[PDB]
Amino acid sequence: MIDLKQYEFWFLVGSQYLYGLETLKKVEQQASKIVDSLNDDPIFPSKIVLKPVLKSSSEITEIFEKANADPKCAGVIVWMHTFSPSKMWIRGLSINKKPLLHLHTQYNREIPWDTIDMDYMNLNQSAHGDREHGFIHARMRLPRKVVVGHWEEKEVREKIAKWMRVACAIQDGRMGQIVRFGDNMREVASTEGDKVEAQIKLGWSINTWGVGELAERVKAVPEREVEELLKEYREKYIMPEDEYSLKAIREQAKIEIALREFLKEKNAVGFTTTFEDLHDLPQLPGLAVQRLMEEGYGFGAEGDWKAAGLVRAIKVMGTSLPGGTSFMEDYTYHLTPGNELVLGAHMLEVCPTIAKEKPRIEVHPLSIGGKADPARLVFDGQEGPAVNASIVDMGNRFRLVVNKVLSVPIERKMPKLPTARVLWKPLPDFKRATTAWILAGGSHHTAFSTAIDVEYLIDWAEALEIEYVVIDENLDLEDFKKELRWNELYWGLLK
Amino acid sequence: MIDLKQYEFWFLVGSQYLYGLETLKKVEQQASKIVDSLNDDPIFPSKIVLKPVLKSSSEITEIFEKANADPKCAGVIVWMHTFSPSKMWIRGLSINKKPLLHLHTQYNREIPWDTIDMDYMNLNQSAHGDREHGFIHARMRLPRKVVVGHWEEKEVREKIAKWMRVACAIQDGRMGQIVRFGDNMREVASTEGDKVEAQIKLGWSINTWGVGELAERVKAVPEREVEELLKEYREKYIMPEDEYSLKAIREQAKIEIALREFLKEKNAVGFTTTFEDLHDLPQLPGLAVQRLMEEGYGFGAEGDWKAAGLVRAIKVMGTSLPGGTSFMEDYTYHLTPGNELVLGAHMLEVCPTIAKEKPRIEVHPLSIGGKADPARLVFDGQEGPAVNASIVDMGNRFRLVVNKVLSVPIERKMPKLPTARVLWKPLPDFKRATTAWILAGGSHHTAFSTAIDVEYLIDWAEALEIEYVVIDENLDLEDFKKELRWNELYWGLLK
Amino acid sequence: MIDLKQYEFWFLVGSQYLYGLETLKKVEQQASKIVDSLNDDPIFPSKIVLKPVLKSSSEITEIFEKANADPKCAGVIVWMHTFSPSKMWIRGLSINKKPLLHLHTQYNREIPWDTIDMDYMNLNQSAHGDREHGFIHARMRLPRKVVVGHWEEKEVREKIAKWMRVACAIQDGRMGQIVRFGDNMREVASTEGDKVEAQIKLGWSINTWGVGELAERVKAVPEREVEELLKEYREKYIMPEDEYSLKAIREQAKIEIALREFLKEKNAVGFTTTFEDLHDLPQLPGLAVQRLMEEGYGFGAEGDWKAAGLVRAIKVMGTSLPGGTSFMEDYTYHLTPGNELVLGAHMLEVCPTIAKEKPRIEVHDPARLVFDGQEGPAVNASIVDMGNRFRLVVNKVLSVPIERKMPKLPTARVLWKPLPDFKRATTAWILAGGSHHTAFSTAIDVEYLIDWAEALEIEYVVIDENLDLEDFKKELRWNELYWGLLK
Ligand SMILES: [Mn+2]
Ligand SMILES: [Mn+2]
Ligand SMILES: [Mn+2]
């Protein structure tokens, strides 16, 4: 249970010393009235601090210098109520490395056709005000998200909420670390990337340990805790009775505790493992990974820290009741000429946030990583639209491929499927989407989410200055190619 | 009449040692069950050779090192039946320069919802398998067409068979020569190019001979050959009776013998001439040129070796009955407000393969290249959708301008047009499709084709890594103007 | 003790069909006369397999196809006895991914001033022949090493020989694998890199194994073999008497065998460990890594697979008797204004190939080898991942004898003066962003690494005695474009 309400977004209001101290107080008053009314609408999942109205050059850098310092400040929102000369913003936007939202709004909705004097016009210069401020953004190449509309209107409140989550997700990643029990699966390429380029460009701290450091913890678990976890299990899951099924549940319980004590110690947010390197671990970690991920931790099997750190960040976005974000691996295809589906699952680890019903603890024999039959949760995937993403290292940079999909109800049950499953249509056609994915060269290790819109992932790349490529219903393949080889240069040398 | 049944494409399947030794046989059985059913389908104009399951790096390089060696292996198909670590593939794909198709498929259409156990999941890891292997093509920038679908379904088979025809038209381009009889027409630009760059980029070996080398062949022709062809002419064409008309036919026959002896001697695929440099040649080459093209020999006029090499490369694609590729020069227009057509012809040379009626031999005096009145075939053009291609050299690189056309039947006869004619509407509008053609700067010397779709040329430029610019029905004049300046960069520095 | 005399270097000759059928045989016989005496010279450590004189455009590919297909072919030498038009070479050079030498020689030394008819001039069209063949190498941007000189004159023989040693060090890397035990030291950056970008560029397959996988090998070692190494330790090294000292030797013995068996089991050229993951391992690898490095295996500590893969590649270049290459780590500094030295060593692992005297075994528990640094000129190098690309920083140094012994230094030490000044060389090394983990070689000269990087199309930056610092900054920033967007 990791939340994001502790995070605050600094609202920033613009004018200049070269104005009457009466109208500057009229915008201070006016802005206050906006954020007061804003912070009361529960669509926003974090605070909005309203800092003094910025007139001077020095006041710009000041507020920024402090906004970069403060670990609770997950983003900035900038809005010029009156004309703010922007050559005051430069030395402030030079020093600011936090996500930007440009909110292009005007306190009053309608034009007072009988009360629009120079007195008022001077107060509400908002129309031109943050066009001048809009250029200096574009002219500096600063990454930001411009949004136009009255704060009264909800559609704009939606757009800024999508950003807020994404902006706070980024910090829960720059702050966070990725724990790696052992390195990648041997001779695998997609899972692999530049550990250094991730800390430079995403701020993703990432460190590898031995598996023997985890094994020393799993054998050291108080026995009176594991039975106090099995009494919580019975409240949700648990197999018929005690057997060789429930010896695995007591083994995964003493694995779950050993991680959670380890993941706090190293400032972790997303971890990763490997199924061919589980020495001194009496069982493959399975039910222990599904529980941790339920709490919010990012995960990626076969050492894949890209997917792990993506699951984490896209988890942090998917807080709202529409909730639903897992770690997915496209395992098999339905190729029926009209309904070309794709069954999404893994060898074990599917997050129960996308569980349509009560997740069912099951144990089945599996040869992969020759050790005791592990426990796992079984449940039919959630219907309704979703997104499937994947970050992948292109040597010099990263790219984010994202497949908008339409999760369909599971039409036939599966008596011999041990893993929880999901069924979806890769939009538009499965051929066009999955041809585009591979053209782009996404990881096999993908990031499923039922919570979040595609827009979220677009704002995420936009605010980290990396390529993103969207597999929408409006997917021309010939167009997508041209996009791939055009993008390649922009993000390649420039940034 | 060079066919391509001789040409073979290598079917490569990927796994890893880190599996049961007997499931690798299960893949061996299963791949065979595919490529055997595939080769029994006669849409594929070349053979397919299944090679043993690839598990180790060693095997990946050892197959690829051979795939460049065998001159009849004109491309490789690649599909991962299970998860195949791509770092195995790097040294292999690093070394490969034969066109790639990435077949993404699954041996069974539907998922056995009641019999899918972890032993079966392990066997068909085909979904997440060639995503991972997909990434290594994207990250190493390796040019390849990817295709997705089930090897049963005809859509996927369509794509791969249109690639095959293209990949073997590349090998019948690198392998062959271009034989010129004189340089380029004086002061003509789009016909000129770097005959050296061609060989580095396209492999097109190209050289130039004198005209007197041909003159020494036309005078040394046995008189029992010119009359053995005439008896084969009468079987198809021939002008009414013995007259000054049937003297031109006995001059084109010996030119066809000389040309034949030359191009076979030089292992030629295309050739090119010039109407201002034919010294010691009693007559301008024409009916002989049109006869050589009816076999499959490429040709350009005015020295055009760009057009000459395309005609061939697009000829080799068109072997099957739909056949119909020529050598075109957009001659005149019908600027009628509704039905804006274009009349593609030449001073003489147009390939009969596009004829819709019996080619009629005709002789008419023409002032282009001072010498005796040459013989030509006169016929109506073939109706139906066609494409009008032109390569041309932009210093650093080449681009492929392809104007899909809708070839209409000729409404009225022309009792005063000497040369065989064609009438089309350049899609979409004549104005758009031309105003775009001139923008992309297409050669006037094009390669008309009523055999192939745009599909072929796109797979071509894709595989050779050159700029392609299509003139679709979807042609947003401005959008095209943005494509030309964006593509500029990509194909300039990178490639 | 992995050799490179198996490797063959295909000598390619250039003529055209468009010649008298006779003269082509005088090119074949004359080339045969060149390589026959050439192979006879022992300065070349790898064979030379002359291949039929190449006239046709088709023959050029065929040999290059053969040249990429044969694993033991680790280079191609080229020389155009007569004028060989280059547009025959294009389709063949395109398909070639094996290091290239353009030899520019003439079978006769002098010009027979009295006897130089067109019948001879048209046979030794060697000058303008490979002058025309040079352009196409320049035009396509193909990597190759151009040499000039009559085959008899030892100077050119050297220049090609160093290439040979380089090229075969490349092929013992494209074929080889780098075995990591554990990842890099946590939060360390110069060790870290793009594992997949390296296989592409440097051909180095690289994969990691959990440290546990090794421990199962060291515990399963026959105890009656670990003595069979102790018996061979006694033939060269060993500590005074049976003591805890020797339980640290039996524990390094049983680590070396396991490393041997594990680095045999896979076609492994270089390896790497880390000191903060050795769970289930009863000791830190030290002696057992110095022994293996003495044989030829490349090593880097704290996971550094970059320094590891270089040490291997630069160990294969170092084969001849002037041998001496070790995995170095510049530890401390003597700052004395006149004799500005540096005391290179490591936490443990220093290769005994640069040993002046008898290597002594010392246990301080990790077991080391105590020996002085080999004097005279050497080279220090480091490969580092600039994210997009790679760069190889190489610092020429003048290793000096050690003036006073150190009774309380457990690790083997090497003293050297980084050329020109200590200030310049080191300021430059840091500007260029060299790894702390280096490859120290007394065996080879700069020349080797220059022809290595040139051959792999990666930036190299030299710290010569001719090191203008200002000019070096400008040289860093101008290199970063070329190796950036282009390669
Ligand atoms: Mn996986
Ligand atoms: Mn013309
Ligand atoms: Mn170190």
mmCIF file of N, CA and C in Angstrom, chain C residues 118-181:
data_model
loop_
_atom_site.group_PDB
_atom_site.id
_atom_site.type_symbol
_atom_site.label_atom_id
_atom_site.label_comp_id
_atom_site.label_asym_id
_atom_site.label_seq_id
_atom_site.Cartn_x
_atom_site.Cartn_y
_atom_site.Cartn_z
ATOM 1 N N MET C 118 57.432 -2.121 -71.751
ATOM 2 C CA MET C 118 55.958 -2.171 -71.525
ATOM 3 C C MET C 118 55.536 -3.587 -71.118
ATOM 4 N N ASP C 119 56.307 -4.602 -71.518
ATOM 5 C CA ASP C 119 56.057 -6.011 -71.133
ATOM 6 C C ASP C 119 56.265 -6.184 -69.622
ATOM 7 N N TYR C 120 57.036 -5.300 -68.974
ATOM 8 C CA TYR C 120 57.329 -5.317 -67.511
ATOM 9 C C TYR C 120 56.456 -4.291 -66.781
ATOM 10 N N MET C 121 56.332 -3.093 -67.355
ATOM 11 C CA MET C 121 55.518 -1.986 -66.793
ATOM 12 C C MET C 121 54.080 -2.472 -66.646
ATOM 13 N N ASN C 122 53.589 -3.266 -67.606
ATOM 14 C CA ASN C 122 52.194 -3.783 -67.636
ATOM 15 C C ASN C 122 52.057 -5.006 -66.714
ATOM 16 N N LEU C 123 53.171 -5.534 -66.190
ATOM 17 C CA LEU C 123 53.193 -6.623 -65.171
ATOM 18 C C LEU C 123 53.212 -6.017 -63.763
ATOM 19 N N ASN C 124 54.005 -4.964 -63.542
ATOM 20 C CA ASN C 124 54.153 -4.319 -62.209
ATOM 21 C C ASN C 124 53.396 -2.990 -62.178
ATOM 22 N N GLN C 125 52.174 -2.980 -62.730
ATOM 23 C CA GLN C 125 51.195 -1.870 -62.581
ATOM 24 C C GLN C 125 50.745 -1.884 -61.117
ATOM 25 N N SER C 126 51.701 -1.986 -60.188
ATOM 26 C CA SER C 126 51.476 -2.209 -58.737
ATOM 27 C C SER C 126 51.216 -0.874 -58.039
ATOM 28 N N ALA C 127 51.947 0.168 -58.444
ATOM 29 C CA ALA C 127 51.840 1.548 -57.915
ATOM 30 C C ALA C 127 50.406 2.053 -58.096
ATOM 31 N N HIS C 128 50.048 2.416 -59.337
ATOM 32 C CA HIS C 128 48.744 3.024 -59.711
ATOM 33 C C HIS C 128 47.629 1.994 -59.550
ATOM 34 N N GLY C 129 47.982 0.724 -59.341
ATOM 35 C CA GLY C 129 47.022 -0.386 -59.206
ATOM 36 C C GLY C 129 46.278 -0.331 -57.891
ATOM 37 N N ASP C 130 47.027 -0.276 -56.792
ATOM 38 C CA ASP C 130 46.444 -0.307 -55.431
ATOM 39 C C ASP C 130 46.369 1.139 -54.944
ATOM 40 N N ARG C 131 46.719 2.095 -55.808
ATOM 41 C CA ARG C 131 46.393 3.531 -55.582
ATOM 42 C C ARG C 131 44.917 3.735 -55.905
ATOM 43 N N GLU C 132 44.442 3.059 -56.969
ATOM 44 C CA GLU C 132 43.029 2.969 -57.459
ATOM 45 C C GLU C 132 42.198 2.076 -56.533
ATOM 46 N N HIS C 133 42.814 1.069 -55.934
ATOM 47 C CA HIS C 133 42.123 0.145 -55.005
ATOM 48 C C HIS C 133 42.024 0.769 -53.609
ATOM 49 N N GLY C 134 42.843 1.782 -53.313
ATOM 50 C CA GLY C 134 42.803 2.505 -52.027
ATOM 51 C C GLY C 134 41.562 3.372 -51.928
ATOM 52 N N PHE C 135 41.225 4.059 -53.019
ATOM 53 C CA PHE C 135 40.092 5.010 -53.133
ATOM 54 C C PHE C 135 38.793 4.336 -52.690
ATOM 55 N N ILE C 136 38.517 3.131 -53.186
ATOM 56 C CA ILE C 136 37.226 2.430 -52.907
ATOM 57 C C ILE C 136 37.145 2.105 -51.413
ATOM 58 N N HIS C 137 38.256 1.736 -50.787
ATOM 59 C CA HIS C 137 38.355 1.573 -49.313
ATOM 60 C C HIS C 137 38.006 2.909 -48.626
ATOM 61 N N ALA C 138 38.549 4.022 -49.125
ATOM 62 C CA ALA C 138 38.283 5.378 -48.594
ATOM 63 C C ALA C 138 36.804 5.706 -48.833
ATOM 64 N N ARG C 139 36.287 5.385 -50.029
ATOM 65 C CA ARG C 139 34.968 5.850 -50.536
ATOM 66 C C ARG C 139 33.821 5.192 -49.763
ATOM 67 N N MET C 140 33.961 3.909 -49.419
ATOM 68 C CA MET C 140 32.930 3.098 -48.705
ATOM 69 C C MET C 140 33.044 3.291 -47.182
ATOM 70 N N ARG C 141 34.163 3.868 -46.711
ATOM 71 C CA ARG C 141 34.521 4.101 -45.278
ATOM 72 C C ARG C 141 34.909 2.764 -44.618
ATOM 73 N N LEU C 142 35.236 1.752 -45.420
ATOM 74 C CA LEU C 142 35.673 0.426 -44.906
ATOM 75 C C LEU C 142 36.880 0.631 -43.995
ATOM 76 N N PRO C 143 36.914 -0.009 -42.814
ATOM 77 C CA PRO C 143 38.100 0.035 -41.966
ATOM 78 C C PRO C 143 39.164 -0.848 -42.611
ATOM 79 N N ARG C 144 40.409 -0.392 -42.598
ATOM 80 C CA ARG C 144 41.571 -1.181 -43.065
ATOM 81 C C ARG C 144 42.847 -0.500 -42.587
ATOM 82 N N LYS C 145 43.954 -1.231 -42.490
ATOM 83 C CA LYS C 145 45.271 -0.620 -42.169
ATOM 84 C C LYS C 145 46.160 -0.575 -43.419
ATOM 85 N N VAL C 146 46.433 0.628 -43.937
ATOM 86 C CA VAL C 146 47.310 0.841 -45.121
ATOM 87 C C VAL C 146 48.751 0.771 -44.625
ATOM 88 N N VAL C 147 49.551 -0.041 -45.317
ATOM 89 C CA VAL C 147 51.024 -0.181 -45.141
ATOM 90 C C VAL C 147 51.649 0.057 -46.519
ATOM 91 N N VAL C 148 52.861 0.615 -46.552
ATOM 92 C CA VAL C 148 53.686 0.821 -47.780
ATOM 93 C C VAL C 148 55.070 0.251 -47.497
ATOM 94 N N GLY C 149 55.663 -0.442 -48.467
ATOM 95 C CA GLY C 149 57.050 -0.921 -48.338
ATOM 96 C C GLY C 149 57.256 -2.234 -49.050
ATOM 97 N N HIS C 150 58.416 -2.379 -49.696
ATOM 98 C CA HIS C 150 58.879 -3.629 -50.354
ATOM 99 C C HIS C 150 58.947 -4.759 -49.325
ATOM 100 N N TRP C 151 58.255 -5.866 -49.590
ATOM 101 C CA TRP C 151 58.073 -7.012 -48.661
ATOM 102 C C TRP C 151 59.381 -7.414 -47.941
ATOM 103 N N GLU C 152 60.556 -7.231 -48.557
ATOM 104 C CA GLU C 152 61.861 -7.692 -47.996
ATOM 105 C C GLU C 152 62.263 -6.809 -46.800
ATOM 106 N N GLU C 153 61.908 -5.511 -46.819
ATOM 107 C CA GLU C 153 62.363 -4.457 -45.856
ATOM 108 C C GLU C 153 61.625 -4.574 -44.508
ATOM 109 N N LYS C 154 62.316 -5.070 -43.468
ATOM 110 C CA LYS C 154 61.731 -5.584 -42.194
ATOM 111 C C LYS C 154 60.761 -4.569 -41.589
ATOM 112 N N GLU C 155 60.902 -3.288 -41.933
ATOM 113 C CA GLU C 155 60.088 -2.205 -41.322
ATOM 114 C C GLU C 155 58.606 -2.513 -41.578
ATOM 115 N N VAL C 156 58.233 -2.754 -42.846
ATOM 116 C CA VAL C 156 56.837 -3.070 -43.300
ATOM 117 C C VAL C 156 56.433 -4.430 -42.725
ATOM 118 N N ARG C 157 57.353 -5.386 -42.733
ATOM 119 C CA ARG C 157 57.128 -6.723 -42.136
ATOM 120 C C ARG C 157 56.677 -6.526 -40.686
ATOM 121 N N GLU C 158 57.342 -5.658 -39.926
ATOM 122 C CA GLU C 158 56.890 -5.357 -38.546
ATOM 123 C C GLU C 158 55.445 -4.838 -38.661
ATOM 124 N N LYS C 159 55.241 -3.762 -39.423
ATOM 125 C CA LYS C 159 53.970 -2.988 -39.459
ATOM 126 C C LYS C 159 52.813 -3.924 -39.761
ATOM 127 N N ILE C 160 53.002 -4.901 -40.630
ATOM 128 C CA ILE C 160 51.938 -5.900 -40.948
ATOM 129 C C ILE C 160 51.841 -6.929 -39.807
ATOM 130 N N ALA C 161 52.958 -7.286 -39.175
ATOM 131 C CA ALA C 161 53.009 -8.326 -38.125
ATOM 132 C C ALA C 161 52.158 -7.892 -36.925
ATOM 133 N N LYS C 162 52.214 -6.607 -36.559
ATOM 134 C CA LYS C 162 51.484 -6.045 -35.385
ATOM 135 C C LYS C 162 49.986 -6.101 -35.682
ATOM 136 N N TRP C 163 49.604 -5.733 -36.910
ATOM 137 C CA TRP C 163 48.236 -5.930 -37.453
ATOM 138 C C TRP C 163 47.825 -7.389 -37.232
ATOM 139 N N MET C 164 48.555 -8.339 -37.827
ATOM 140 C CA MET C 164 48.314 -9.795 -37.635
ATOM 141 C C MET C 164 47.925 -10.028 -36.170
ATOM 142 N N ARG C 165 48.826 -9.721 -35.228
ATOM 143 C CA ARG C 165 48.639 -10.010 -33.779
ATOM 144 C C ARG C 165 47.335 -9.378 -33.303
ATOM 145 N N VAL C 166 47.007 -8.182 -33.812
ATOM 146 C CA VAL C 166 45.764 -7.421 -33.468
ATOM 147 C C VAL C 166 44.561 -8.206 -34.009
ATOM 148 N N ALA C 167 44.507 -8.395 -35.324
ATOM 149 C CA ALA C 167 43.370 -9.030 -36.026
ATOM 150 C C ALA C 167 42.999 -10.347 -35.327
ATOM 151 N N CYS C 168 43.976 -11.184 -34.943
ATOM 152 C CA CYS C 168 43.713 -12.527 -34.339
ATOM 153 C C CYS C 168 43.266 -12.342 -32.882
ATOM 154 N N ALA C 169 43.627 -11.215 -32.269
ATOM 155 C CA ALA C 169 43.124 -10.833 -30.932
ATOM 156 C C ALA C 169 41.650 -10.441 -31.053
ATOM 157 N N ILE C 170 41.233 -9.926 -32.218
ATOM 158 C CA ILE C 170 39.807 -9.576 -32.505
ATOM 159 C C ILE C 170 38.991 -10.874 -32.605
ATOM 160 N N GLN C 171 39.454 -11.827 -33.434
ATOM 161 C CA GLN C 171 38.756 -13.111 -33.729
ATOM 162 C C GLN C 171 38.700 -13.969 -32.453
ATOM 163 N N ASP C 172 39.637 -13.782 -31.518
ATOM 164 C CA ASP C 172 39.611 -14.487 -30.208
ATOM 165 C C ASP C 172 38.731 -13.713 -29.221
ATOM 166 N N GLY C 173 37.645 -13.142 -29.728
ATOM 167 C CA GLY C 173 36.756 -12.229 -28.993
ATOM 168 C C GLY C 173 35.367 -12.300 -29.584
ATOM 169 N N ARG C 174 35.298 -12.251 -30.916
ATOM 170 C CA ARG C 174 34.077 -12.493 -31.734
ATOM 171 C C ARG C 174 33.635 -13.945 -31.548
ATOM 172 N N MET C 175 34.611 -14.862 -31.431
ATOM 173 C CA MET C 175 34.434 -16.313 -31.151
ATOM 174 C C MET C 175 34.293 -16.538 -29.648
ATOM 175 N N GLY C 176 35.137 -15.867 -28.861
ATOM 176 C CA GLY C 176 35.223 -16.048 -27.399
ATOM 177 C C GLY C 176 33.951 -15.620 -26.689
ATOM 178 N N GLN C 177 33.882 -15.831 -25.375
ATOM 179 C CA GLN C 177 32.787 -15.335 -24.499
ATOM 180 C C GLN C 177 33.410 -14.748 -23.231
ATOM 181 N N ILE C 178 32.778 -13.741 -22.629
ATOM 182 C CA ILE C 178 33.217 -13.146 -21.332
ATOM 183 C C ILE C 178 32.304 -13.668 -20.226
ATOM 184 N N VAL C 179 32.845 -14.437 -19.286
ATOM 185 C CA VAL C 179 32.047 -15.068 -18.199
ATOM 186 C C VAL C 179 32.130 -14.163 -16.971
ATOM 187 N N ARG C 180 30.988 -13.627 -16.542
ATOM 188 C CA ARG C 180 30.868 -12.826 -15.302
ATOM 189 C C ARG C 180 30.341 -13.741 -14.202
ATOM 190 N N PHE C 181 31.005 -13.700 -13.043
ATOM 191 C CA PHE C 181 30.497 -14.227 -11.752
ATOM 192 C C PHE C 181 30.028 -13.019 -10.941
#
